[PDB]
């Protein structure tokens, strides 16, 4: 039964910055898998990096397992976008008679949920824009502004987002996607950790036989 | 009808969102009514204006009904070093080096930052010296504005990239001719439904011009 | 004449601008005289050097007379994860996982960060591992330096883009042959007017004189 307790908020002794995300969550519509961590700058909670997240819009932030999320990473949800049909000025916010110009959901340029897969490495000070989907095993370069979807096992960076490269061949990627090591039982993961780390996919497929 | 533009904190229970105009204390900054800054921590809009020096005499001008996102910063002309030879600012250190004080003519001055009306500036935008941003423009979050921005266009990136024009050229000229932001508030209130949904055709009719 | 390069705070009223070299307490950080960091709040230059681990042994090297803007950060080689398989750093959590501590040969190490002399680094610049920046370069504000920078060039953006060369190739070669930053301070002072106003012809005649 090796490995840390995923219910541990601070799984590293002496370290007051790095947090397992899941057991810190208190707000709704934030769904984060076990072992995924946030390496905070100064002890701030992961939740406070999630911005413009309003119940009435009801968009969700979804993050898988074994993700590495760097310090200062922020998640921009759908509340951040104004109506763009005419004036972008949010008259309704100021009330005093203007509250009747409250936008309907259909009026807003909603983009849907932010969905981050498993085993994703997000660099320092990354900004994630509304509705973005990030595939399994992707790597987001430091200081990136993720303005569009990211394919699984690809490396991207920049502002706006640029494609850097695929981590592996298309065939190897499909093998990792078929395997889904993150969904294996922890006992199986533990026994297979050397191959998960060194990327020996062919070996994992053999252990795959049972 | 509508809020008081002289009220610093026009949203009940909100201590971050400020009407900018009544917070201005400095010369060489002009901001139009109803334009607001949604601060991160309650910092003032003036705290976001950097390298702005009286001796340089550059100005920051912002129109009416602008939306300015958290952490937006305005870089004025004091930020640039002399570039004819070494960029090192010897004069700062005195002890004999003060006689190398630069002339304003020796500096790469870019002029005023001028932002139009009904402009929406995203979170954490950086605006570089001498930039002009036209009416109705939209600046994407985290953008670094390094060149002028055409009216009613959307832009973003570092360096700044053109994303798209919001409307057709003909429509844009209609908005620029209309200038609803300069109308009396009584007339604005009457036309708010169309100002908001962009029914420029109704707005034209409602104006009742010498057609 | 000029300030004492051992003075941490060489400007009288100023609590933010620090000469870097005398503040350095760490190993593997080598910074030349007169190079300064104009801090945001008051932090130290070393606070801006991140993921710098003795076990990696990489070095941050900065020449003389560099101007480093506020919020500039230096990302050392400790910031990169192993990329052969999962990027997840199991070893950090121990409880049995300490066995999987990665070795140096399994890491994507990029080498030392090396910044030349007379380099101007703008506000809020990020410097990635293994980057080399040549003498006299200028790094635009908010840039993310993702690759090497030629001497006497201007670059900016995220990722980094080439803007332009500061001078003609012939002039750049003359500045590089000159290396004024390496001359004795008596000679520096004597030639400060020409170093500052970019009179490279004069500097060249002066150099030929005592060669
Ligand atoms: C959760 C945590 O604990 S996170 C911890 C904190 N650590 C970090 O933030 C570090 C994150 N790491 C990075 O950003 C790294 O630089 C990585 C992942 C991009 C390294 O990728 P590598 O493949 O090793 O980069 P490499 O140096 O080969 O560059 C690859 C290409 O992309 C370009 N590139 C590099 N960085 C960027 C970028 N940020 N944006 C766009 N392109 C970039 C390079 O120029 C190169 O292209 P070229 O060959 O055409 O020039
Ligand atoms: C004052 C206040 O209250 S501010 C409140 C805080 N809110 C904010 O900061 C949010 C501001 N909004 C944004 O930045 C949004 O992303 C907007 C305005 C750019 C949305 O633009 P949309 O028209 O919806 O564009 P959409 O998302 O479809 O993308 C359009 C293009 O822009 C590209 N794009 C998106 N973001 C950027 C960017 N930041 N830089 C460059 N290009 C971008 C997209 O890739 C797409 O290009 P493509 O079709 O070639 O891929
Ligand atoms: C240590 C200290 O004390 S630092 C103090 C803080 N000061 C700073 O941070 C300011 C540093 N200065 C800058 O960033 C300046 O904008 C400079 C040095 C890049 C300007 O260089 P310049 O040659 O003046 O000017 P210029 O303004 O002419 O622009 C030339 C090109 O650069 C482009 N450009 C400007 N900024 C950027 C940028 N940040 N990234 C990429 N391109 C840029 C411009 O668009 C233009 O390109 P184009 O011709 O393709 O349109
Ligand atoms: Cl300032
Ligand atoms: Cl001007
Ligand atoms: Na860019």
């Amino acid at each position: 039964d090796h490995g840390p307790d995923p219910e541990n908020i601070l799984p590293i002794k002496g370290n007051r910055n790095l947090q397992f995300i899941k057991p810190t969550i208190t707000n709704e519509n934030i769904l984060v898998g076990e072992y995924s961590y946030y390496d905070s700058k100064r002890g701030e909670s992961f939740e406070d990096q999630v911005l413009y997240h309003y119940e009435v819009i009801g968009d969700k932030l979804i993050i898988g397992r074994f993700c590495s999320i760097g310090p200062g990473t922020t998640f921009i949800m759908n509340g951040a976008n104004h109506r763009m049909d005419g004036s972008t000025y949010p008259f309704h916010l100021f009330r005093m008679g203007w509250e009747k110009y409250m936008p309907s959901l259909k009026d807003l340029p909603l983009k849907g949920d932010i969905e981050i897969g498993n085993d994703v490495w997000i660099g320092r000070d990354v900004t994630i824009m509304p509705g973005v989907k990030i595939g399994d095993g992707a790597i987001i370069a430091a200081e990136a502004v993720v303005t569009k979807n990211v394919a699984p096992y690809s490396i991207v960076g920049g502002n706006p987002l640029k494609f850097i490269r695929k981590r592996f061949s298309d065939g190897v990627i499909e093998e990792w996607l078929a395997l889904q090591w993150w969904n294996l039982d922890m006992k199986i993961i533990n026994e297979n950790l050397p191959f998960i780390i060194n990327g020996d996919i062919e070996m994992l497929k053999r252990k795959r036989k049972l």
Side-chain angles (χ1 to χ4, degrees), chain A:
Chain A
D1 296 326
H2 274 175
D5 188 336
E7 289 181 318
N8 236 94
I9 290 174
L10 298 167
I12 304 183
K13 178 177 184 58
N15 191 325
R16 293 174 54 89
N17 289 331
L18 193 148
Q19 307 159 53
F20 277 155
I21 298 169
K22 186 175 178 186
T24 68
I25 301 305
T26 81
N27 271 99
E28 318 179 5
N29 295 325
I30 299 177
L31 306 173
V32 183
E34 285 185 340
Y35 303 102
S36 287
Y37 74 88
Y38 175 53
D39 190 23
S40 71
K41 276 178 183 170
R42 41 202 99 251
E44 75 278 359
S45 73
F46 174 84
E47 277 181 330
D48 296 337
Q49 299 299 122
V50 184
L51 308 180
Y52 305 99
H53 201 200
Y54 302 136
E55 298 173 10
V56 63
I57 296 180
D59 53 341
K60 300 184 190 70
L61 171 58
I62 306 179
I63 299 177
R65 294 175 159 125
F66 297 101
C67 285
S68 303
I69 302 179
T73 294
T74 71
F75 301 81
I76 308 301
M77 305 295 287
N78 286 276
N81 285 321
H82 298 198
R83 186 180 179 175
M84 297 168 51
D85 296 313
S87 175
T88 59
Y89 190 84
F91 295 93
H92 66 282
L93 290 181
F94 304 101
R95 305 191 64 79
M96 309 290 304
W98 286 358
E99 63 272 11
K100 68 190 184 181
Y101 303 111
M102 171 75 57
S104 71
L105 295 178
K106 176 71 182 306
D107 288 335
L108 301 174
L110 304 180
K111 305 269 177 60
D113 307 326
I114 293 178
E115 304 184 25
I116 297 177
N118 304 273
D119 196 34
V120 176
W121 178 19
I122 301 184
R124 182 181 183 96
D125 286 330
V126 163
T127 303
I128 312 277
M129 299 301 293
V132 151
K133 323 296 180 191
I134 297 178
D136 300 307
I139 299 172
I140 317 299
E143 318 278 2
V145 178
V146 187
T147 49
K148 64 221 292 186
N149 293 340
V150 182
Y153 289 95
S154 70
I155 301 180
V156 297
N159 176 13
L161 201 71
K162 307 301 295 178
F163 179 76
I164 299 179
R165 73 176 191 270
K166 291 296 188 60
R167 296 178 62 194
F168 317 114
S169 70
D170 293 343
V172 164
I173 290 180
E174 291 190 72
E175 297 183 15
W176 287 102
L177 292 179
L179 173 67
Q180 297 177 45
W181 63 263
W182 41 83
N183 291 328
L184 294 174
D185 205 270
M186 185 51 54
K187 270 301 182 177
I188 301 306
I189 298 183
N190 269 319
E191 296 184 354
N192 292 269
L193 269 184
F195 310 112
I196 296 176
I197 296 169
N198 64 13
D200 199 333
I201 184 60
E202 299 176 35
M203 186 60 184
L204 279 172
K205 294 179 60 188
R206 301 178 199 266
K207 298 262 308 228
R208 191 40 169 155
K209 320 307 218 231
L210 68 161

